[PDB]
Write a protein that binds this DNA or RNA. Structure first.
Ligand SMILES: [Mg+2]
Ligand SMILES: [Mg+2]
Ligand SMILES: [Mg+2]
Ligand SMILES: [Mg+2]
Ligand SMILES: [Mg+2]
Ligand SMILES: [Mg+2]
Ligand SMILES: [Mg+2]
Ligand SMILES: [Mg+2]
Ligand SMILES: [Mg+2]
Ligand SMILES: [Mg+2]
Ligand SMILES: [Mg+2]
Ligand SMILES: [Mg+2]
Ligand SMILES: [Mg+2]
Ligand SMILES: [Mg+2]
Ligand SMILES: [Mg+2]
Ligand SMILES: [Mg+2]
Ligand SMILES: [Mg+2]
Ligand SMILES: [Mg+2]
Ligand SMILES: [Mg+2]
Ligand SMILES: [Mg+2]
Lengths: 83, 55, 114, 119, 104, 98
RNA sequence: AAACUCCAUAUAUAUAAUUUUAAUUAUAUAUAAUUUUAUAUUAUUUAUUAAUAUAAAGAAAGGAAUUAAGACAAAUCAUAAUGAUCCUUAUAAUAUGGGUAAUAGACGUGCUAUAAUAAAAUGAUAAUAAAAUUAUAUAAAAUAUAUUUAAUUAUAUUUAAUUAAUAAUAUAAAACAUUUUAAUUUUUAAUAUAUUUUUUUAUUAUAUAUUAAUAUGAAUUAUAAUCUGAAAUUCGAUUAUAUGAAA
């Protein structure tokens, strides 16, 4: 956990266009902190291959952006291993 | 520790002024260590030697 | 006319490999503006200054290109370019410190016996 | 046998250790504070409690987060994580480690214990 | 394999004894976001409720309201923790510092 | 000290039957003598194992109790000594000058 | 092969104004042993001798490096280098994210435990070491904090001295003494008791179970802080309040 006195992790994002025009924000900044001003905004978070669209909620505030954009999908085992 | 703290801190800041030293009685985060850290750029830059060696 | 990096830097005299060139460029750029990084880090971590100053300082730190971060620098073998088991006393990788040592290239190194 | 809030205690064990052990939410420090507040000497046993003393312990220990309340807080926190859609909530649902541990080997106790209804 | 509770012999409600269902209910006062209070006939046993968010504080239901205070569920998040843990870094003047990335 | 010495000497066997693979039909079980250190080791193992059947929580106390009992000729370790010797007798004739 | 070689050992000389101290040391040269001598009891090619012991003269007893020729078409083209072949708007070069950290099963190494020939607290004229590190630094003492008078533990405040036989990393830890320790009714406390007094004895209470997880064990997880970094979500390390699997 980042020290509180340092302040939240902050990154330049096109928030003005999203607040007024409603354009979704597409970013690779998965380490940015969801500030309370991002509630109700449409984000699209990179995951290495594709940008996952999510809309920030009140409960998500304070978390990081990449916490909702999984990078590797669920592990599965092919039972019919054969040989 | 019978001596009052007021006397001890009076000696503390007097010495600090004499010896050109910081005095932060409250212990707040002044960030002094950031500035006082040495610059290592000259040494890190010459890791691969003199680029002007005769060829 | 198509230099791989924004600033035209000189070339190392010894062994050169693409990776070395990258690391060397990072070294020179970090050296150039390490004072700026230190000043910005001070402001962004100072609660005695207005929070706007902290905000802009943090913003400008986050915007600095990768080639000004000290953390980016990785020590490499100056004779082979390998970036594992590099001994700072010689800047030589493993098996190149050994080879050169046996050759007697290193000023005082010896075969360990005790 | 001394019964406090439905918890069975032998007559030989010290109050502080027994309290810290049987109740979910109070540890060594909280038990020490509880015993000190009611004036029970540090190494007093459960035999020597009187009915007023047992009542005071039950009453004073019921003004702080009970076993059920603490478990509710934990479960609510997990539910928050899962409903947000966070990575950690996903690990809880799948019975997998949540603190960045390796799953290629081990990860047995996480599978056995991690769940959305953690105790 | 269905979960079904077995059915007991249904009692005979012979003709003329079909009494109506009058479920126990309480005269319960419903406090809205404003001072408005409406009396609702409810089964749950407690007489007053406050509605944290309701039609009063919903923009959809009050298009003409210039000033409209907004409040949401308080379970944990911005209003709860982000504020007290970060109570020095302040502003929407500050929101203009991270306004745009100036990227095409 | 001499109580322990006589305890070890009386309790420890003089010779034990060590089975050797010699003998295709059956392993040759021939008595073989033991020096003092070997005998003391066997006796000590017996009295320690016997001293571990006592209620105290400190093995200095339980070792002392067993040693006192042995000093008065009261313990089961003697039966083991007799069994080994009877076994050695049961194997009289296979000893060879070699 | 052995020997010369290096660490270590015993001794001699030299250096050090014994405030870089420790001289009980440091490191240069040299000597020493791959020990010698005597006696006897042995088997023998008959002391033109080997092992058995004794005796007496010795400080005298170890480790490291060096692993031949050939064989394994053993490993390495990912230390590096070249032959052949293949790519040249891409198989070369840069940046932002992700992966190398995925988990059914299996497997080789280790760490930590499953309690009383063993774990925990405390021990300030601070019991007792060696070898290493500190110009891309080491960081004492004092402070605020958690936290109570203090101590211990972890951060923050500030840099004392030292770029080193000088100061710091750093009061070594086990050891040893005292106290405690569930299973354990082998315990506690209420009275008396007394030439066991930190203790014995008599009566009452110290319940509910059984092969068992404790005041063993710290896995998993909730929350709040802290450190490094521009950045700790995938994916870092500590502290505190709870959690307390398996064994
Ligand atoms: Mg690095
Ligand atoms: Mg508890
Ligand atoms: Mg001296
Ligand atoms: Mg040789
Ligand atoms: Mg060979
Ligand atoms: Mg051969
Ligand atoms: Mg091959
Ligand atoms: Mg290859
Ligand atoms: Mg190559
Ligand atoms: Mg490419
Ligand atoms: Mg790997
Ligand atoms: Mg190995
Ligand atoms: Mg133990
Ligand atoms: Mg030393
Ligand atoms: Mg030395
Ligand atoms: Mg200190
Ligand atoms: Mg000590
Ligand atoms: Mg079990
Ligand atoms: Mg424990
Ligand atoms: Mg803990």
């Amino acid at each position: 956990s980042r020290s509180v006195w340092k302040g939240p992790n902050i990154v330049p994002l096109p928030i003005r266009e999203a607040m007024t025009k409603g354009t979704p924000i597409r970013t690779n900044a998965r380490a940015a902190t969801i500030l309370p001003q991002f509630v109700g905004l449409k984000f699209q978070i990179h995951n290495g291959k594709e940008y996952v669209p999510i809309e920030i909620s009140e409960d998500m505030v304070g978390h990081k952006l990449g916490e909702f954009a999984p990078t590797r999908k669920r592990f599965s085992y092919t039972q019919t291993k054969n040989k | 520790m019978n001596v009052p703290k007021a006397r001890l801190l009076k000696v503390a800041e007097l010495s600090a002024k004499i010896f050109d030293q910081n005095f932060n009685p409250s212990g707040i985060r002044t960030g002094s260590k950031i500035l006082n850290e040495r610059l290592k750029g000259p040494s890190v830059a010459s890791y691969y030697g003199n680029p002007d060696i005769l060829k | 006319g198509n230099f791989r990096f924004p600033i035209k830097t000189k070339l190392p005299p010894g062994f050169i490999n693409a990776r070395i060139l990258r690391d060397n460029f990072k070294r020179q750029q970090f050296k150039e503006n390490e004072i700026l990084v230190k000043s910005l880090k001070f402001i962004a971590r100072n609660m005695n200054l207005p929070t706007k100053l902290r905000l802009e300082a943090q913003l400008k730190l986050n915007a600095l290109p990768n080639y000004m971060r000290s953390t980016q620098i990785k020590n490499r073998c100056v004779d082979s370019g390998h970036a594992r088991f590099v001994l700072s006393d010689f800047r030589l990788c493993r098996y190149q410190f050994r080879e050169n040592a046996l050759k007697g290239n290193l000023p005082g190194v010896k075969k360990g016996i005790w | 046998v001394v019964h406090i809030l439905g918890k069975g205690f032998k007559g030989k064990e010290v109050i502080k250790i027994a309290l810290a052990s049987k109740f979910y939410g109070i540890g060594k420090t909280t038990a020490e504070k509880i015993c000190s507040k009611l004036g029970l000497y540090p190494w007093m046993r459960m035999h020597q409690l009187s009915e007023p003393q047992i009542m005071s312990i039950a009453s004073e220990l019921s003004t702080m987060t009970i076993e059920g309340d603490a478990r509710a807080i934990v479960k609510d926190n997990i539910a928050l994580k899962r409903k947000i859609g966070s990575y950690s909530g996903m690990r809880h649902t799948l019975h997998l480690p949540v603190r960045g541990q390796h799953t290629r080997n081990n990860a047995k106790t996480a599978r056995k214990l991690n769940k959305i209804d953690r105790r | 394999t269905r979960i079904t509770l077995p059915r007991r012999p249904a009692k005979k409600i012979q003709l003329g004894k079909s009494r109506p269902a009058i479920y126990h209910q309480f005269n319960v006062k419903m406090e809205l976001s404003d001072g408005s209070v409406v009396i609702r006939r409810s089964q749950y046993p407690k007489g007053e409720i406050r509605l944290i968010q309701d039609q009063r504080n919903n923009p959809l239901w009050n298009p003409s309201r210039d000033d409209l205070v907004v409040v949401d569920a308080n379970s944990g998040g911005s209003l709860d923790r982000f504020n007290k843990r970060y109570s020095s870094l302040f502003s929407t003047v500050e929101l203009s510092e991270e306004n745009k990335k100036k990227t095409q | 000290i001499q109580a322990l010495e006589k305890s070890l000497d009386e309790l420890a066997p003089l010779m034990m039957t060590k089975t050797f693979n010699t003998g295709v039909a059956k392993a040759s079980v021939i008595p073989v003598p033991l020096n003092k250190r070997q005998r003391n080791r066997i006796a000590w193992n017996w009295i320690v194992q016997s001293a571990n059947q006592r209620v105290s929580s400190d093995f200095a106390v339980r070792l002392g109790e067993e040693l006192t009992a042995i000093a008065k000729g009261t313990s089961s370790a003697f039966e083991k000594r007799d069994q080994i010797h009877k076994t050695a007798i049961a194997h009289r004739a296979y000893i060879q000058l070699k």
